[PDB]
Coordinates of C-alpha atoms and ligand atoms in Angstrom, one line a residue:
Chain S
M16 CA 0.0 0.0 0.0
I17 CA 1.3 3.4 -1.1
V18 CA 0.3 6.3 1.1
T19 CA 1.3 9.7 -0.2
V20 CA 1.0 12.9 2.0
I21 CA 0.1 15.9 -0.1
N22 CA -0.3 19.6 0.6
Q23 CA 0.6 22.5 -1.7
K24 CA 1.0 24.8 1.3
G25 CA 4.1 24.7 3.4
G26 CA 4.2 24.1 7.1
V27 CA 0.9 22.2 7.4
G28 CA 2.4 19.1 8.8
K29 CA 3.2 16.8 5.8
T30 CA 6.5 15.7 7.2
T31 CA 5.1 15.1 10.7
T32 CA 2.3 13.0 9.3
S33 CA 4.7 10.9 7.1
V34 CA 7.2 10.4 10.0
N35 CA 4.6 9.4 12.6
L36 CA 2.3 7.4 10.3
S37 CA 5.3 5.4 8.9
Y38 CA 6.6 4.8 12.5
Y39 CA 3.2 3.7 13.6
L40 CA 2.8 1.3 10.6
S41 CA 6.2 -0.2 11.2
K42 CA 5.1 -1.6 14.5
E43 CA 3.6 -4.7 12.7
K44 CA 4.1 -4.2 9.0
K45 CA 7.3 -3.7 6.9
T46 CA 7.2 0.0 6.3
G47 CA 9.3 2.4 4.2
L48 CA 9.4 6.2 4.1
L49 CA 10.3 7.9 0.8
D50 CA 11.5 11.5 1.3
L51 CA 10.6 13.2 -2.0
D52 CA 11.1 16.7 -0.6
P53 CA 14.6 18.0 -1.7
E54 CA 14.7 19.9 1.6
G55 CA 14.6 16.5 3.5
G56 CA 12.2 17.3 6.4
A57 CA 11.5 13.6 7.0
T58 CA 15.2 12.8 6.6
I59 CA 16.1 15.4 9.3
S60 CA 13.2 14.0 11.4
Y61 CA 15.0 10.6 11.4
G62 CA 18.3 12.1 12.5
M63 CA 19.9 12.2 9.0
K64 CA 21.1 14.9 6.6
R65 CA 20.1 15.0 2.9
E66 CA 22.7 13.4 0.8
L67 CA 25.0 15.7 -1.3
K68 CA 25.1 13.2 -4.1
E69 CA 22.9 12.9 -7.2
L70 CA 21.5 9.4 -6.4
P71 CA 18.9 7.6 -8.4
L72 CA 15.5 7.4 -6.8
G73 CA 15.2 4.8 -4.1
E74 CA 18.9 3.8 -4.2
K75 CA 20.0 4.8 -0.7
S76 CA 18.0 3.8 2.4
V77 CA 18.7 3.4 6.2
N78 CA 16.7 1.3 8.7
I79 CA 16.2 3.7 11.6
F80 CA 13.6 3.1 14.4
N81 CA 12.3 0.1 12.3
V82 CA 11.4 2.4 9.4
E83 CA 13.3 2.0 6.1
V84 CA 14.0 5.7 5.4
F85 CA 15.0 6.7 1.9
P86 CA 16.9 10.0 2.6
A87 CA 16.4 13.0 0.5
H88 CA 19.3 13.9 -1.8
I89 CA 20.3 16.6 -4.3
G90 CA 19.4 14.3 -7.2
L91 CA 15.7 14.9 -6.5
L92 CA 16.4 18.6 -7.4
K93 CA 17.1 17.5 -11.0
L94 CA 14.0 15.3 -11.1
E95 CA 12.0 18.3 -9.8
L96 CA 13.2 20.2 -13.0
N97 CA 13.7 17.7 -15.8
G98 CA 12.0 14.6 -14.5
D99 CA 9.5 12.5 -16.5
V100 CA 6.3 11.9 -14.5
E101 CA 5.9 8.5 -16.1
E102 CA 9.5 7.3 -15.2
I103 CA 9.4 8.6 -11.7
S104 CA 5.9 7.0 -11.1
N105 CA 7.2 3.7 -12.3
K106 CA 10.2 3.9 -10.0
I107 CA 8.0 4.7 -7.0
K108 CA 5.9 1.6 -7.8
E109 CA 9.0 -0.6 -8.0
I110 CA 10.1 0.8 -4.6
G111 CA 6.6 0.3 -3.0
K112 CA 6.6 -3.4 -4.0
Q113 CA 9.1 -4.1 -1.2
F114 CA 6.8 -2.8 1.6
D115 CA 3.4 -3.4 3.1
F116 CA 3.4 0.4 3.5
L117 CA 5.3 3.0 1.6
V118 CA 4.7 6.5 3.1
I119 CA 5.8 9.3 0.8
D120 CA 6.6 12.7 2.0
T121 CA 6.3 15.3 -0.7
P122 CA 7.5 18.9 -1.2
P123 CA 5.1 21.9 -0.7
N124 CA 4.5 22.4 -4.4
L125 CA 2.7 20.9 -7.4
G126 CA 6.0 19.8 -9.0
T127 CA 7.1 16.6 -10.7
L128 CA 7.8 14.6 -7.6
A129 CA 4.6 15.5 -5.8
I130 CA 2.5 14.8 -8.9
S131 CA 4.1 11.4 -9.4
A132 CA 3.7 10.4 -5.8
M133 CA 0.1 11.6 -5.9
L134 CA -0.6 9.7 -9.1
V135 CA 0.9 6.3 -7.9
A136 CA -0.6 6.6 -4.4
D137 CA -3.2 4.1 -3.2
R138 CA -4.1 6.5 -0.4
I139 CA -3.7 10.2 -0.6
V140 CA -3.6 12.0 2.8
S141 CA -3.8 15.7 3.2
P142 CA -3.6 17.7 6.5
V143 CA -5.6 20.9 6.7
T144 CA -5.0 23.7 9.2
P145 CA -7.0 26.7 10.4
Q146 CA -4.6 28.9 8.5
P147 CA -6.2 30.5 5.3
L148 CA -3.7 29.3 2.8
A149 CA -4.3 25.7 3.9
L150 CA -8.0 26.2 3.2
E151 CA -7.2 27.5 -0.3
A152 CA -4.9 24.5 -0.8
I153 CA -7.5 22.0 0.3
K154 CA -10.0 23.5 -2.2
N155 CA -7.4 23.4 -5.0
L156 CA -6.6 19.8 -4.1
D157 CA -10.3 19.0 -4.3
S158 CA -10.6 20.6 -7.8
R159 CA -7.4 19.1 -9.3
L160 CA -8.2 15.7 -7.7
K161 CA -11.7 16.0 -9.1
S162 CA -10.2 16.3 -12.6
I163 CA -8.4 12.9 -12.6
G164 CA -11.1 11.6 -10.3
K165 CA -9.0 10.5 -7.3
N166 CA -9.7 10.9 -3.6
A167 CA -7.8 12.2 -0.6
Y168 CA -8.4 11.9 3.1
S169 CA -8.1 15.2 5.0
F170 CA -7.5 15.5 8.7
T171 CA -6.8 18.6 10.8
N172 CA -3.5 19.7 12.4
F173 CA -2.7 22.6 14.7
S174 CA -6.3 22.6 16.0
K175 CA -8.4 21.3 18.9
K176 CA -11.5 21.5 16.6
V177 CA -11.9 19.8 13.2
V178 CA -11.7 21.9 10.0
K179 CA -14.1 20.8 7.3
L180 CA -15.0 22.5 4.1
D181 CA -18.4 22.3 2.3
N182 CA -18.9 21.1 -1.3
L183 CA -15.5 19.3 -1.6
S184 CA -16.7 15.9 -2.9
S185 CA -13.3 14.5 -3.6
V186 CA -11.9 15.2 -0.1
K187 CA -13.1 13.1 2.8
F188 CA -12.7 15.1 6.0
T189 CA -12.1 12.7 8.9
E190 CA -12.8 13.6 12.5
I191 CA -9.1 13.5 13.4
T192 CA -7.8 16.7 14.9
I193 CA -4.2 17.0 16.2
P194 CA -4.0 20.0 18.7
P195 CA -0.9 22.2 19.0
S196 CA 1.6 20.2 21.0
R197 CA 5.3 21.0 21.8
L198 CA 5.8 17.2 21.9
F199 CA 6.2 17.5 18.1
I200 CA 8.6 20.5 18.5
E201 CA 10.7 18.6 21.0
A202 CA 10.8 15.4 19.0
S203 CA 11.7 17.1 15.7
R204 CA 14.5 18.9 17.6
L205 CA 15.7 15.6 18.9
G206 CA 15.4 14.1 15.4
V207 CA 13.0 11.1 16.1
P208 CA 9.4 10.4 15.5
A209 CA 7.1 12.1 18.0
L210 CA 5.2 8.8 18.4
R211 CA 8.5 7.3 19.6
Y212 CA 9.5 10.3 21.8
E213 CA 6.1 10.2 23.4
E214 CA 6.6 6.6 24.8
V215 CA 9.4 8.0 27.0
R216 CA 8.5 11.7 27.5
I217 CA 5.0 11.4 29.0
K218 CA 3.2 8.8 31.2
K219 CA 0.0 8.5 29.1
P220 CA 0.8 8.8 25.3
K221 CA -1.9 10.6 23.4
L222 CA -0.5 10.9 19.8
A223 CA -0.8 7.2 19.1
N224 CA -4.5 7.5 18.9
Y225 CA -4.4 10.1 16.0
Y226 CA -2.2 7.9 13.8
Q227 CA -4.1 4.7 14.7
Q228 CA -7.2 6.5 13.5
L229 CA -5.5 7.6 10.3
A230 CA -4.2 4.1 9.6
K231 CA -7.7 2.8 10.4
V232 CA -9.6 5.1 8.0
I233 CA -7.2 4.6 5.1
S234 CA -6.6 0.8 5.4
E235 CA -8.0 -1.4 2.6
Chain R
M26 CA 42.7 11.2 17.2
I27 CA 41.6 7.6 17.9
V28 CA 39.8 7.0 21.2
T29 CA 39.1 3.4 22.1
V30 CA 36.7 2.6 25.0
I31 CA 37.8 -0.7 26.6
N32 CA 36.5 -2.9 29.4
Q33 CA 36.3 -6.7 29.5
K34 CA 33.6 -6.6 32.2
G35 CA 30.1 -6.4 30.7
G36 CA 27.6 -3.7 31.5
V37 CA 30.0 -1.2 32.9
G38 CA 29.2 1.6 30.5
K39 CA 31.4 1.1 27.4
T40 CA 28.6 1.8 24.9
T41 CA 27.1 4.7 26.8
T42 CA 30.6 6.3 27.0
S43 CA 31.4 5.7 23.3
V44 CA 28.0 7.0 22.1
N45 CA 27.9 10.1 24.3
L46 CA 31.6 11.0 23.8
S47 CA 31.4 10.7 20.1
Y48 CA 28.2 12.8 20.1
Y49 CA 29.8 15.5 22.2
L50 CA 32.8 15.6 20.0
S51 CA 30.5 15.8 16.9
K52 CA 29.4 19.3 18.1
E53 CA 32.8 20.8 17.0
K54 CA 34.8 18.3 15.1
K55 CA 34.3 15.7 12.3
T56 CA 33.6 12.6 14.5
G57 CA 33.0 9.0 13.7
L58 CA 31.9 6.0 15.8
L59 CA 33.2 2.5 15.1
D60 CA 31.1 -0.3 16.6
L61 CA 33.4 -3.3 17.1
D62 CA 30.9 -5.2 19.3
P63 CA 29.0 -7.8 17.3
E64 CA 26.0 -7.3 19.6
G65 CA 25.9 -3.7 18.4
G66 CA 25.2 -1.6 21.5
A67 CA 26.4 1.7 19.9
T68 CA 24.4 0.8 16.7
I69 CA 21.2 0.4 18.7
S70 CA 22.0 3.6 20.6
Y71 CA 21.9 5.3 17.2
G72 CA 18.5 3.9 16.2
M73 CA 19.9 1.1 14.0
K74 CA 20.3 -2.7 13.9
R75 CA 23.5 -4.6 13.3
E76 CA 23.7 -5.7 9.7
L77 CA 22.8 -9.3 8.9
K78 CA 25.5 -9.3 6.3
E79 CA 29.2 -10.2 6.6
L80 CA 30.6 -6.9 5.7
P81 CA 34.2 -5.8 5.3
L82 CA 35.4 -3.8 8.3
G83 CA 34.4 -0.1 8.0
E84 CA 32.4 -0.4 4.8
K85 CA 28.8 0.6 5.8
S86 CA 28.3 3.8 7.7
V87 CA 25.4 6.2 8.4
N88 CA 25.5 9.8 9.5
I89 CA 23.1 9.8 12.5
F90 CA 22.8 12.9 14.8
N91 CA 26.0 14.4 13.2
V92 CA 28.0 11.2 14.0
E93 CA 29.4 9.0 11.3
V94 CA 28.4 5.6 12.7
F95 CA 29.9 2.4 11.4
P96 CA 27.2 -0.1 12.5
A97 CA 28.1 -3.5 13.9
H98 CA 27.5 -6.5 11.6
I99 CA 27.8 -10.2 11.7
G100 CA 31.1 -10.0 9.7
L101 CA 32.7 -8.9 13.0
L102 CA 32.4 -12.5 14.2
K103 CA 34.8 -13.9 11.7
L104 CA 37.2 -11.0 12.3
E105 CA 37.1 -11.8 16.0
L106 CA 38.5 -15.3 15.3
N107 CA 40.6 -15.1 12.1
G108 CA 41.2 -11.4 11.9
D109 CA 44.9 -10.6 11.2
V110 CA 45.8 -8.2 14.1
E111 CA 48.1 -6.1 12.0
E112 CA 45.6 -6.1 9.1
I113 CA 42.8 -5.0 11.4
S114 CA 45.0 -2.3 13.0
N115 CA 45.9 -0.9 9.6
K116 CA 42.3 -0.9 8.5
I117 CA 41.3 0.9 11.7
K118 CA 44.0 3.5 11.1
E119 CA 42.8 3.7 7.5
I120 CA 39.3 4.4 8.8
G121 CA 40.3 6.9 11.4
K122 CA 42.5 9.1 9.2
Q123 CA 39.3 10.6 7.8
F124 CA 38.1 11.9 11.1
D125 CA 39.2 14.4 13.7
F126 CA 37.9 11.9 16.3
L127 CA 37.2 8.2 15.9
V128 CA 35.5 6.8 19.0
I129 CA 35.6 3.0 19.1
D130 CA 33.2 0.8 21.0
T131 CA 34.5 -2.7 21.9
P132 CA 32.9 -6.0 23.1
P133 CA 33.3 -7.1 26.7
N134 CA 36.3 -9.2 26.0
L135 CA 40.0 -9.3 25.1
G136 CA 39.6 -10.6 21.6
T137 CA 41.2 -9.6 18.3
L138 CA 39.0 -6.6 17.4
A139 CA 39.4 -5.1 20.9
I140 CA 43.1 -5.7 21.0
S141 CA 43.6 -4.1 17.6
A142 CA 41.6 -1.1 18.7
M143 CA 43.8 -0.9 21.7
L144 CA 47.0 -1.1 19.6
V145 CA 46.2 1.7 17.2
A146 CA 44.5 3.9 19.8
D147 CA 45.9 7.4 20.5
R148 CA 43.8 7.4 23.8
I149 CA 42.1 4.5 25.6
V150 CA 39.3 5.2 28.0
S151 CA 38.0 2.7 30.6
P152 CA 34.9 3.1 32.8
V153 CA 35.0 1.4 36.2
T154 CA 32.0 0.9 38.4
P155 CA 32.3 0.2 42.2
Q156 CA 31.1 -3.4 41.8
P157 CA 33.5 -6.1 43.1
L158 CA 34.1 -7.7 39.6
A159 CA 35.0 -4.3 38.0
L160 CA 38.0 -3.9 40.2
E161 CA 39.4 -7.2 39.0
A162 CA 38.6 -6.1 35.5
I163 CA 40.6 -2.9 35.8
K164 CA 43.4 -4.9 37.4
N165 CA 43.8 -7.3 34.5
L166 CA 43.4 -4.4 32.1
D167 CA 46.5 -2.9 33.6
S168 CA 48.2 -6.3 32.9
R169 CA 46.9 -6.1 29.4
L170 CA 48.0 -2.5 28.9
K171 CA 51.6 -3.2 30.0
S172 CA 51.7 -6.2 27.6
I173 CA 51.1 -4.0 24.6
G174 CA 53.0 -0.9 25.8
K175 CA 49.9 1.2 26.3
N176 CA 48.3 3.3 29.0
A177 CA 44.7 4.3 29.7
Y178 CA 42.5 6.8 31.4
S179 CA 40.0 5.5 33.9
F180 CA 36.8 7.2 35.1
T181 CA 33.9 6.1 37.3
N182 CA 30.3 5.3 36.2
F183 CA 27.2 4.5 38.2
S184 CA 28.5 6.5 41.2
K185 CA 28.8 9.8 43.0
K186 CA 32.1 8.5 44.4
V187 CA 35.3 8.2 42.4
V188 CA 37.1 4.8 42.2
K189 CA 40.9 4.9 42.3
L190 CA 43.5 2.2 42.7
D191 CA 47.1 2.8 43.9
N192 CA 48.9 -0.2 42.6
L193 CA 48.4 0.1 38.8
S194 CA 50.8 2.4 36.9
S195 CA 49.4 2.0 33.3
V196 CA 46.0 3.2 34.4
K197 CA 45.7 6.9 35.2
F198 CA 42.7 7.5 37.5
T199 CA 40.8 10.7 36.8
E200 CA 38.4 12.4 39.1
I201 CA 35.5 12.0 36.6
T202 CA 32.5 10.2 38.1
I203 CA 29.1 9.8 36.4
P204 CA 26.2 9.3 38.9
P205 CA 23.3 6.9 38.2
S206 CA 20.8 8.7 36.1
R207 CA 17.5 7.7 34.6
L208 CA 18.3 9.8 31.5
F209 CA 20.6 7.0 30.1
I210 CA 17.8 4.4 30.6
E211 CA 15.2 6.6 28.9
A212 CA 17.6 7.4 26.0
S213 CA 18.4 3.8 25.4
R214 CA 14.7 3.1 25.3
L215 CA 14.5 5.8 22.6
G216 CA 17.6 4.6 20.8
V217 CA 19.4 8.0 20.9
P218 CA 22.5 9.3 22.6
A219 CA 21.7 10.4 26.1
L220 CA 23.3 13.8 25.5
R221 CA 20.9 14.6 22.6
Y222 CA 17.9 13.4 24.6
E223 CA 18.9 15.5 27.6
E224 CA 19.5 18.6 25.4
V225 CA 15.9 18.3 24.3
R226 CA 14.3 17.1 27.5
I227 CA 15.4 19.6 30.3
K228 CA 16.0 23.3 30.6
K229 CA 19.6 23.1 31.7
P230 CA 21.4 20.0 30.4
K231 CA 24.0 18.7 32.8
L232 CA 25.3 15.4 31.5
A233 CA 27.5 17.3 29.0
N234 CA 29.9 18.3 31.8
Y235 CA 31.1 14.8 32.4
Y236 CA 31.9 14.2 28.7
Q237 CA 33.5 17.7 28.5
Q238 CA 35.8 16.6 31.4
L239 CA 36.6 13.4 29.5
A240 CA 37.4 15.2 26.3
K241 CA 39.6 17.7 28.2
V242 CA 41.5 15.0 30.1
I243 CA 42.1 12.8 27.0
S244 CA 43.2 15.6 24.7
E245 CA 45.9 17.2 26.9
Ligands
ANP314 N1 0.3 19.5 16.0 C1 1.5 20.1 16.0 N2 1.7 20.9 17.1 C2 2.9 21.6 17.2 N3 3.9 21.6 16.3 C3 3.6 20.9 15.2 C4 2.5 20.1 15.0 N4 2.5 19.5 13.8 C5 3.7 19.8 13.3 N5 4.4 20.7 14.1 C6 5.7 21.3 13.9 O1 5.6 22.3 12.9 C7 6.7 22.3 12.1 C8 6.3 22.2 10.6 O2 5.7 20.9 10.4 P1 6.1 20.0 9.2 O3 5.7 18.6 9.5 O4 7.5 20.2 8.7 O5 5.2 20.5 8.0 P2 5.6 20.4 6.5 O6 4.3 20.4 5.6 O7 6.4 19.1 6.2 N6 6.6 21.7 6.1 P3 7.1 21.6 4.5 O8 7.6 20.2 4.2 O9 8.3 22.7 4.3 O10 6.0 22.0 3.5 C9 7.7 21.2 12.6 O11 8.7 21.7 13.4 C10 6.7 20.3 13.3 O12 7.4 19.6 14.4
ANP315 N1 25.4 6.4 34.8 C1 24.4 5.6 34.4 N2 23.2 5.7 35.0 C2 22.2 4.8 34.6 N3 22.2 3.9 33.7 C3 23.4 3.8 33.1 C4 24.6 4.6 33.3 N4 25.6 4.3 32.5 C5 25.1 3.3 31.8 N5 23.8 3.0 32.0 C6 23.0 2.0 31.4 O1 23.5 0.7 31.7 C7 23.3 -0.2 30.6 C8 24.6 -0.8 30.2 O2 25.5 0.2 29.8 P1 26.4 0.0 28.5 O3 26.8 1.3 28.0 O4 25.6 -0.8 27.4 O5 27.6 -0.9 29.0 P2 28.4 -1.9 28.0 O6 29.7 -2.1 28.6 O7 28.6 -1.3 26.6 N6 27.5 -3.3 27.9 P3 28.4 -4.5 27.1 O8 28.7 -4.1 25.6 O9 27.5 -5.8 27.1 O10 29.7 -4.8 27.8 C9 22.6 0.7 29.4 O11 21.2 0.4 29.4 C10 22.9 2.1 29.9 O12 21.9 3.0 29.5
MG316 MG1 8.3 18.5 4.8
MG317 MG1 19.3 -2.8 5.1
MG318 MG1 28.6 -2.1 24.8
MG319 MG1 27.9 10.0 3.9

């Protein structure tokens, strides 16, 4: 199963979702994380730096915290400029064949990598925020997804109350809402998944429920 | 500079010392960590698993938390038996030339990998706990150190009180003592160096003073 996390707007929580969903899924299924953002947010979130080599897509990977992380690298930049959507899509599918779950983190744009990951995805996951630009982006995702007739699952981040938009037929808003929490800030500073930092940091973990609900709603 | 962490007694703190000293050094100098224990304590402390491949010594490495970590692998086993001591020594020097600091974790024994790491070390560090068996271990470590024309710095772990011993001349006894702290246990649970975890977990990190003392004493 290929799960791609998409949002045109930056800072909405794409990397956090990819990191924690892949970490949650790796608890009982063989999971990989493909960092298609050239800036390597997910790579940094697993304690690594983006590779200063032009690697082919999917070549280099490290098993960290039971997730097979494919670190971001400068080669992606080239693909972001010259890449063929068909070729990149096929490579992503060949990569996904080795995992029960391949979570793909994508850049905050509508570029080649994001479009390829969005096209090959079995599940498309988008976080929405109370911020205005995220609302514009969720409506744009609904329109462009309407065109090729694919669906996404939207959940809410940076909020205690769900954000839902009316007359977006291609975007299923779940009831999941992830409130502001400096657990995420501390875990990202440390360079580990927040789901993993939580098991040590607090007595009663609370973030595991969000990602269990996400995996629940998207699975099969 | 090559720093080798040595103790034949198990569970005294070899891996904690290797992991945290290499991490501390990584803040200012190009630092690597060479895991020469086939059970891979340092590797696990950097969120990884020992490789189920018989690798040549020093081939695989991952930059985790700014440390170039050479994960343990099953190929160490063969090298423990049939490893040419001079070959292994030259390979370790070969590896360490690329770093300002190469911290080396060793198994709890006297075998070929450990003894090579002792031979080509610029500094050897030994943690001693106030347990009864640890004193015999530091004793016979002095016997080992004289037999190879080498000398080592000793500090105390799991204690507010320093351990020193009068009789042994190849073992310089520092005043450095590291008290029992639940930070190390929480960090091993996480699979990160305790220094990094502490720098994210509390307002005023305080474990770094011990490893600063260690760096100061071993670099004079
Ligand atoms: N619910 C939350 N509460 C508090 N901080 C959060 C939350 N979710 C995410 N963050 C933090 O907000 C920052 C940005 O989140 P991030 O996951 O990088 O979004 P992003 O979409 O990947 N940014 P980008 O890849 O550049 O488009 C990170 O430092 C996260 O740790
Ligand atoms: N000062 C300390 N306070 C509390 N726990 C500690 C302290 N130092 C080490 N530990 C813990 O003690 C355990 C054993 O330490 P470790 O660093 O693995 O020693 P070791 O010599 O490498 N074990 P081994 O490779 O089998 O000989 C680990 O779980 C550490 O986190
Ligand atoms: Mg990101
Ligand atoms: Mg592997
Ligand atoms: Mg050890
Ligand atoms: Mg490298």
